[PDB]
Amino acid sequence: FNVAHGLAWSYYIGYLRLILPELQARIRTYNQHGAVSQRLYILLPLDCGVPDNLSMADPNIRFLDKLPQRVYSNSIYELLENGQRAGTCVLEYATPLQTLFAMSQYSQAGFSREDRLEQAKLFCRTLEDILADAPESQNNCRLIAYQEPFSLSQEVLRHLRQEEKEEVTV
Amino acid sequence: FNVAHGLAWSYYIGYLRLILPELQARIRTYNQHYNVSQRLYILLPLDCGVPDNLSMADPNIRFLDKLPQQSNSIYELLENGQRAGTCVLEYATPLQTLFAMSQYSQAGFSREDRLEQAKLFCRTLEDILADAPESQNNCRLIAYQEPFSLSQEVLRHLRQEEKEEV
């Protein structure tokens, strides 16, 4: 009874597959007006704790604007270092992770905190395999899996600079 | 391996648990007028084929109104052009996720796998609602395998519910 399989497939079939194909084009139009990354960075906190505002999780992550255009709203966030803009990217949480959290607060589910973490890892692996064989192929999508004990802004910044490195070497 | 498990739990955790608790109150406030049923009837077509308009599936199923808040819609059921029943009718949306996977070659999801997961989705959702407080027996599942009148199949369940109520 692996609930992550359904959550991952539904997350790709019902959401990721419908916003990723034209994601770059929306970013390119924005970048015509600083610069924004080309990929959608999805945060996968293995504790399955998704706050309503990303600014709370890390003070160095601050809202900048929403990416201009079923229709779904993605928003561009800027990451800070000593109060200075070190990176800006489209950041969003893995929404199915809250479904794992709500199940663990549902006594009739039998979902323990250990089961939630275990399913969170399965959700991350399955989405990886899905996107790997996917037309978007993570070419517009990066997966951020992190287990809080940690600067979240530093972890996304590390991947952003690596993406820029790849963009100029390859 | 079984993708229906996630779809069922997500459908209950992310949707059913948030509309079912107050469903009767919204229907009761609506039912103040025209002094209909108290349950949410979910259609589970085992073909995983969800039309955009329910009127197409059966011409005897017609839209009447949307349940006002305190989005679900109230449908009217016909028999020989006469209204024989009125209820809040809706599809099990995760069934389209099963259909889209069957049209995704990279998934490895065959038409036989779609039916198997559709049946598993129905059984799993049944057990979930059985042990659920929010269910309150205000939600009934209509599972039907197309070969049958869908309007008649729902009608059979509405009259049974009224029978039990008295």
């Binding site: 997350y11 019902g14 779904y72 929404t95 | 459908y11 949707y15 949306t93």
Partner: peptide, 7 residues
Amino acid sequence: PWSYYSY
């Protein structure tokens, strides 16, 4: 509907 994820 099933706009479970952000919209």
